[PDB]
Enzyme design. Structure first.
Site, mmCIF file in Angstrom:
data_model
loop_
_atom_site.group_PDB
_atom_site.id
_atom_site.type_symbol
_atom_site.label_atom_id
_atom_site.label_comp_id
_atom_site.label_asym_id
_atom_site.label_seq_id
_atom_site.Cartn_x
_atom_site.Cartn_y
_atom_site.Cartn_z
ATOM 1 N N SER A 161 3.421 3.057 8.109
ATOM 2 C CA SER A 161 3.155 2.083 7.051
ATOM 3 C C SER A 161 4.431 1.577 6.402
ATOM 4 O O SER A 161 5.333 2.360 6.123
ATOM 5 C CB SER A 161 2.272 2.718 5.979
ATOM 6 O OG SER A 161 0.945 2.890 6.449
ATOM 7 N N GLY A 162 4.505 0.268 6.191
ATOM 8 C CA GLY A 162 5.678 -0.332 5.577
ATOM 9 C C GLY A 162 6.824 -0.580 6.544
ATOM 10 O O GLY A 162 7.748 -1.319 6.226
ATOM 11 N N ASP A 195 -0.159 -7.614 1.733
ATOM 12 C CA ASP A 195 0.357 -6.249 1.757
ATOM 13 C C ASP A 195 1.877 -6.220 1.964
ATOM 14 O O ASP A 195 2.380 -5.911 3.051
ATOM 15 C CB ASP A 195 -0.362 -5.440 2.840
ATOM 16 C CG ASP A 195 -0.071 -3.956 2.763
ATOM 17 O OD1 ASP A 195 0.439 -3.488 1.732
ATOM 18 O OD2 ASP A 195 -0.354 -3.256 3.749
ATOM 19 N N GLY A 231 1.746 6.812 8.689
ATOM 20 C CA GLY A 231 3.116 7.223 8.458
ATOM 21 C C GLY A 231 4.124 6.163 8.845
ATOM 22 O O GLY A 231 5.311 6.279 8.528
ATOM 23 N N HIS A 251 0.811 -1.213 0.000
ATOM 24 C CA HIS A 251 0.000 0.000 0.000
ATOM 25 C C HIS A 251 0.852 1.274 0.000
ATOM 26 O O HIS A 251 0.328 2.384 -0.045
ATOM 27 C CB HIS A 251 -1.073 -0.011 1.113
ATOM 28 C CG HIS A 251 -0.571 0.313 2.486
ATOM 29 N ND1 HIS A 251 -0.485 -0.628 3.488
ATOM 30 C CD2 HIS A 251 -0.199 1.491 3.048
ATOM 31 C CE1 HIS A 251 -0.077 -0.053 4.606
ATOM 32 N NE2 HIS A 251 0.098 1.235 4.367
HETATM 33 C C1 LIG Z 1 -9.224 -0.800 2.657
HETATM 34 O O1 LIG Z 1 -9.517 0.593 2.930
HETATM 35 C C2 LIG Z 1 -9.441 1.100 4.258
HETATM 36 C C3 LIG Z 1 -9.155 0.265 5.360
HETATM 37 C C4 LIG Z 1 -9.080 0.752 6.679
HETATM 38 C C5 LIG Z 1 -8.771 -0.374 7.698
HETATM 39 C C6 LIG Z 1 -9.287 2.134 6.925
HETATM 40 S S1 LIG Z 1 -9.171 2.800 8.525
HETATM 41 O O2 LIG Z 1 -10.065 2.090 9.400
HETATM 42 O O3 LIG Z 1 -9.273 4.235 8.650
HETATM 43 N N1 LIG Z 1 -7.649 2.470 9.029
HETATM 44 C C7 LIG Z 1 -6.539 3.264 8.578
HETATM 45 C C8 LIG Z 1 -6.141 4.178 9.747
HETATM 46 C C9 LIG Z 1 -5.555 5.481 9.277
HETATM 47 O O4 LIG Z 1 -5.434 5.723 8.045
HETATM 48 O O5 LIG Z 1 -5.248 6.284 10.165
HETATM 49 C C10 LIG Z 1 -5.337 2.454 8.151
HETATM 50 O O6 LIG Z 1 -5.295 1.253 8.350
HETATM 51 N N2 LIG Z 1 -4.361 3.182 7.541
HETATM 52 C C11 LIG Z 1 -3.098 2.632 7.090
HETATM 53 C C12 LIG Z 1 -1.943 3.213 7.957
HETATM 54 C C13 LIG Z 1 -2.033 2.584 9.336
HETATM 55 C C14 LIG Z 1 -1.407 1.369 9.616
HETATM 56 C C15 LIG Z 1 -1.517 0.803 10.893
HETATM 57 C C16 LIG Z 1 -2.248 1.424 11.932
HETATM 58 C C17 LIG Z 1 -2.367 0.807 13.305
HETATM 59 N N3 LIG Z 1 -1.458 -0.038 13.765
HETATM 60 N N4 LIG Z 1 -3.388 1.070 14.090
HETATM 61 C C18 LIG Z 1 -2.869 2.656 11.614
HETATM 62 C C19 LIG Z 1 -2.754 3.239 10.356
HETATM 63 C C20 LIG Z 1 -2.964 3.134 5.667
HETATM 64 O O7 LIG Z 1 -2.417 4.214 5.499
HETATM 65 N N5 LIG Z 1 -3.450 2.401 4.635
HETATM 66 C C21 LIG Z 1 -3.386 2.942 3.277
HETATM 67 C C22 LIG Z 1 -4.802 3.276 2.814
HETATM 68 C C23 LIG Z 1 -5.694 2.007 2.939
HETATM 69 C C24 LIG Z 1 -5.716 1.551 4.417
HETATM 70 C C25 LIG Z 1 -4.285 1.218 4.880
HETATM 71 C C26 LIG Z 1 -9.560 2.992 5.808
HETATM 72 C C27 LIG Z 1 -9.796 4.515 5.955
HETATM 73 C C28 LIG Z 1 -9.640 2.474 4.489
HETATM 74 C C29 LIG Z 1 -9.941 3.358 3.252
#
Ligand SMILES: COc1cc(C)c(S(=O)(=O)N[C@@H](CC(=O)O)C(=O)N[C@H](Cc2ccc(C(=N)N)cc2)C(=O)N2CCCCC2)c(C)c1C
Ligand SMILES: [Ca+2]
Length: 223
Positions: free
Chosen positions: A177-178, A84, A175, A40
């Site tokens: 991520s990865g 992923d 941020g 991602h």
């Molecule tokens: C499949 O589409 C999804 C899936 C999820 C689960 C979400 S979420 O619930 O907001 N969760 C977000 C949380 C956020 O963006 O703040 C997320 O997992 N984001 C990850 C980044 C991330 C990773 C781990 C954690 C954690 N350990 N709690 C939080 C954030 C991300 O950028 N991506 C890219 C965009 C798609 C979703 C994953 C969203 C908005 C979309 C559009």
């Protein structure tokens, strides 16, 4: 990273920053010319930054190397986040030293209860926004598959594992991520997704790296 601590300059030598004019994702150096990150995080025009601590200040231990090729897992599903994982090849080999070193791939999967080190330059707030300029670290245990599946009904696949605290308050975030999840000196996970950050009963979900060791080895061997 929410609820973590300042790692310390170059104490996590395998941590890389993916830059496209700004830091957008983390990653792990697995060998002098290959970086593993989350699918991602895929983007064109990626420059890999190694030896970083403060990403806004040149401190003297950095190596900025452009990517020559990016390979997203063949079965990556952007809707479910299954598979992923992505491999990035550097245009030139990094100079490995004490501050820039590769992390070993696991020979086996880490079990629940195992303590792991998670790191990144992601958001430090669960409600609100504040990005740190220096690397943040978090120690967190791998949760059982049952607690994981119970926290995320119908979303956890065999290629994912939960790590963190059900109490909330500590977790990876936007941020990160990865980024790497190291357990027993090996790369076991990749920061993938979660329901928000550090929310109660909503731990972080990570890509289970041990399931991809064959794909990783084969790919590197032919590219
Ligand atoms: C499949 O589409 C999804 C899936 C999820 C689960 C979400 S979420 O619930 O907001 N969760 C977000 C949380 C956020 O963006 O703040 C997320 O997992 N984001 C990850 C980044 C991330 C990773 C781990 C954690 C954690 N350990 N709690 C939080 C954030 C991300 O950028 N991506 C890219 C965009 C798609 C979703 C994953 C969203 C908005 C979309 C559009
Ligand atoms: Ca720097």
């Amino acid at each position: 990273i929410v609820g973590g601590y300042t790692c310390g300059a170059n104490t996590v030598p395998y941590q890389v920053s993916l830059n496209s004019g700004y830091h957008f994702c983390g990653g792990s150096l697995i060998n002098s010319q290959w970086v593993v990150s989350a699918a991602h995080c895929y983007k064109s025009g990626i420059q890999v930054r190694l030896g970083e601590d403060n990403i806004n200040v040149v401190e003297g231990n950095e190596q900025f190397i452009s990517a020559s090729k990016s390979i997203v897992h063949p079965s990556y599903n952007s809707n479910t986040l299954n598979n992923d994982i992505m491999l990035i090849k550097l245009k030139s080999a990094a100079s490995l030293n004490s501050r820039v070193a590769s992390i070993s791939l696991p020979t086996s999967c880490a079990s629940a209860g195992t303590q792991c080190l998670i790191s990144g330059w992601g958001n430090t707030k669960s409600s609100g926004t504040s990005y740190p300029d220096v690397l943040k670290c978090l120690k967190a245990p791998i949760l059982s598959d049952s607690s994981c599946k119970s926290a995320y009904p119908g979303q956890i696949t065999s290629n994912m594992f939960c790590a963190g605290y059900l109490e909330g308050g500590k977790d990876s975030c936007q941020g990160d991520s990865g980024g790497p999840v190291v357990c027993s000196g090996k790369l076991q996970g990749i920061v993938s997704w979660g329901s928000g950050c550090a929310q109660k009963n909503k731990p972080g979900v990570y890509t289970k790296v041990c399931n991809y060791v064959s794909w990783i080895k084969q790919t590197i061997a032919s590219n």
